[PDB]
């Protein structure tokens, strides 16, 4: 063993070992524990290449305790001319035909979070796609609004419909008969005893078609 | 070149080079290859800061061969008082106006996986949002259940509707006329020859409105 | 301080410090800046283990400027026998009961991207689930096609319906009355003045049920 009381600088560091090759611990209010930087401006060089051959353990663990930031924060620095149309911030490949591996898995093992499970926020003023902690889904709703149904879709822009279905729509019997409609007016379409019914905004209930 | 036959300890390691700055290889059944740890409890210090200026290659590659874990596993250690409402496990920023970069891209280049493409599982007993390997989507279905349509939504909790649409609903002609309904009863709404039809649970088929 | 003019090799590198423990900078068109490799084929060893105790800063930052690749690229090397049914490429755990932390957050802080916010592409020829830069959503649409509504669902495979709703469907009044239908034929279902209406493919408009 060799102990340097100060910093070491070198052209390169390498270890091929049965010990843990690196343990880098920093305690500071200003310094990161590690910076890895690829300054090349072309070629086949990444900043960081991580590989595991061990099937019994995650190739990589990341744990944080942030109050107002992402545990992993990924920035893609794009191009004003749109020459990055084939790039992504995050790309996942599930390789090997026959695999049953999942793509993205999100849970909360001590109990449900009160925060959004996913929030895609590209267009100003909107939640393009959001799944709330409650499980309700918004599609084009006002940003940070509470969805007013299990799934809430708003027709935006020059879209000609809120919803297109190329196929049939099954509607199960409602467990509770509606007594109201949405604040956007219109009405409530539901099944009751196998029949199709509409409650309109003025409170008229019509059986449209029988069981 | 300098070869240490044993471990090296130092106050800091730095390299500014044209070689690969670090190669850390471990072969073990108990040791990780590398641990990076920020022990600070406040300030602007991260554990790991990775940057690339090379547009021709991913800033970071991660490859694993896990049988029952995530290739990247991210844990956010939260707070019982909800003081982490602005935090996230994963945060992506697509910067530079004019960019055409994508957010999240998932595929399976050797053939389709049999596992879930995404599974958001916050609430006990439920799949809040799941996209199966088949492409079917569940919203509030029982956890791990097979969706019973291309998209299957269940009205949960105190939601007043399964689906709210602020706009019109287009229904294309069904390629195959329904001959059955869902196990939750109710019926099947479909278009046929431009007309709107309902099949009820007792098998009655009604043309509600003409083409 | 100690300066090595050449490469250093050792059995292990460790630092427990108040400085940044590691700064690894490479400028090259062929070399990565760092490779971390777990060559073990069993056990509890990961390649990389990253931990932060600092709540004021992301545990990990990643920044890239790719034109045609992912900033973070994750590959899971699977198994032909499906013995990886419990594995995932990305796994997120929001821990601590009471937490309000979010799962996945995606935005574009300089203005909207023109690329897909999320694209799940498992089945050949299809977009299983895609959210376009515009916010439109496709479910089973042809891969890379533009959705023809805010949400566009296609009944695929042996699914018996495009959409199943176990609950009621609220339809708000349409801000603009439809004057056309989809290219898949059928018609347009909408609310108008609290009433339910259908426009069929031949242009007939029927009030199905009153407000
Ligand atoms: Na639009
Ligand atoms: Na609820
Ligand atoms: Na199917």
In whole angstroms, what is the distance from residue A135 CA to residue A151 CA? 9
In whole angstroms, what is the distance from residue A84 CA to residue C204 CA? 46
Helices (H) and strands (E) in chain A, counts: 0, 21
Asked if the C-beta of C179 comes within 8 angstroms of chain A's C-beta atoms, the answer is no
Decide: A7 and B9 in contact? Cβ < 8 Å.
Answer: no
Residue A81: Cβ within 10 Å count:
11
- Nominal resolution (angstroms): 1.5
Asked if the C-beta of B109 comes within 8 angstroms of chain C's C-beta atoms, the answer is no
Q: Measuring CA to CA, which residue among C134, C144, C101, A84 is closest to residue B95?
A: A84
Q: Measuring CA to CA, which residue among A93, A87, A62 is closest to residue A75?
A: A87
In whole angstroms, what is the distance from residue C148 CA to residue B100 CA? 21
For residue A121, count CB atoms less than 10 angstroms from its CB and return exposed for 0-12, middle for 13-18, buried for 19 or more.
buried
In whole angstroms, what is the distance from residue C11 CA to residue A150 CA? 56
In whole angstroms, what is the distance from residue B32 CA to residue C91 CA? 19
Asked if the C-beta of C180 comes within 8 angstroms of chain B's C-beta atoms, the answer is no
Q: A91: which 2 tokens?
A: 């790309």
A178: Cβ–Cβ under 8 A, 6 or more apart, which residues?
Answer: A188, A190, A199, B160, B161, C168
Decide: C38 and C47 in contact? Cβ < 8 Å.
Answer: yes
Helices (H) and strands (E) in chain B, counts: 0, 21
In whole angstroms, what is the distance from residue C133 CA to residue C113 CA? 6
In whole angstroms, what is the distance from residue B59 CA to residue A75 CA? 10
Q: Measuring CA to CA, which residue among A92, A71, A203, C168 is closest to residue B115?
A: A92
Q: Do C89 and A93 touch (CB under 8 A)?
A: yes
Q: How was this structure determined?
A: X-ray
Decide: A189 and A198 in contact? Cβ < 8 Å.
Answer: yes
In whole angstroms, what is the distance from residue B137 CA to residue B133 CA? 10
DSSP-derived pairing of the beta strands C205-209 and C195-200: antiparallel
C155 Cα–ligand 3 center, Å: 9
In whole angstroms, what is the distance from residue A139 CA to residue A127 CA? 7
Asked if the C-beta of C124 comes within 8 angstroms of chain A's C-beta atoms, the answer is no
- Torsion sign over Cα C194, B188, C152, C129: positive
Whole-angstrom CA distances from B179 to B173, B201, B204, C47 are 15, 10, 10, 54
Considering only CB atoms, C185 lies closest to which of B44, B154, B172, namely B172
Running DSSP on this structure, what letter comes out for residue A75?
Answer: E
In whole angstroms, what is the distance from residue C40 CA to residue B33 CA? 9
Q: Measuring CA to CA, which residue among A49, C48, A12 is closest to residue B14?
A: A12
Decide: C35 and B22 in contact? Cβ < 8 Å.
Answer: yes
In whole angstroms, what is the distance from residue C121 CA to residue B178 CA? 28
Over chain C, what HEC string results?
A: CEECCCEEECCEEEEEECCCCEEEEECCCCCCCEEEEECCCCCCCCCEEEEECCCCCCCEEEEECCCCCEEEEEEEECCCCCCCCCCEEEEEEEECCCCCCEEEEEECECECCCCCCEEEECCCCEECEEECCCCCEEECEECCCCCCCCEEEECCCCCCCCEEEECCEEECECCCCCCCCCCCCCEEEEEECCEEEEEECCCCEEEEECC
Q: Do C38 and A53 touch (CB under 8 A)?
A: yes
Running DSSP on this structure, what letter comes out for residue B143?
Answer: T
Residue C191: Cβ within 10 Å count:
31
- In the block, tokens 């007939």 appear at C204
In whole angstroms, what is the distance from residue A34 CA to residue C26 CA? 14
Q: Measuring CA to CA, which residue among C166, C170, C141 is closest to residue C153?
A: C141
């Amino acid at each position: 063993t060799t102990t340097f009381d100060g910093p070491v600088a070198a052209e390169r560091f390498s270890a091929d070992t049965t010990l843990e090759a690196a343990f880098l611990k920093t305690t500071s209010e200003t310094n990161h524990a590690a910076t890895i930087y690829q300054a090349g401006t072309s070629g086949d060089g990444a900043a960081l290449n991580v590989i595991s051959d061990n099937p019994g353990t995650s190739a990589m663990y990341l744990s944080g305790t942030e109050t107002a930031r992402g545990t992993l924060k990924i920035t893609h620095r794009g191009y004003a001319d749109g020459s990055d149309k084939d790039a992504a911030a995050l790309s996942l490949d599930l390789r090997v035909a026959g695999t049953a591996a999942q793509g993205i898995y999100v849970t909360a093992t001590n109990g449900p979070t009160k925060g959004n499970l996913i929030a895609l926020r590209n267009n100003t003023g909107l939640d393009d796609f959001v799944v709330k902690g409650t499980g309700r889904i918004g599609v084009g709703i006002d940003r940070a609004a509470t969805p007013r149904a299990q799934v809430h879709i708003v027709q935006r822009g020059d879209a000609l419909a809120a919803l297109l279905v190329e196929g049939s729509v099954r509607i199960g019997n409602a467990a509770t008969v509606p007594t109201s409609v949405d604040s956007s007016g219109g009405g409530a379409l539901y099944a009751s005893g196998g029949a199709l019914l509409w409650r309109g905004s003025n409170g008229t209930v019509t059986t449209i078609a029988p069981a």
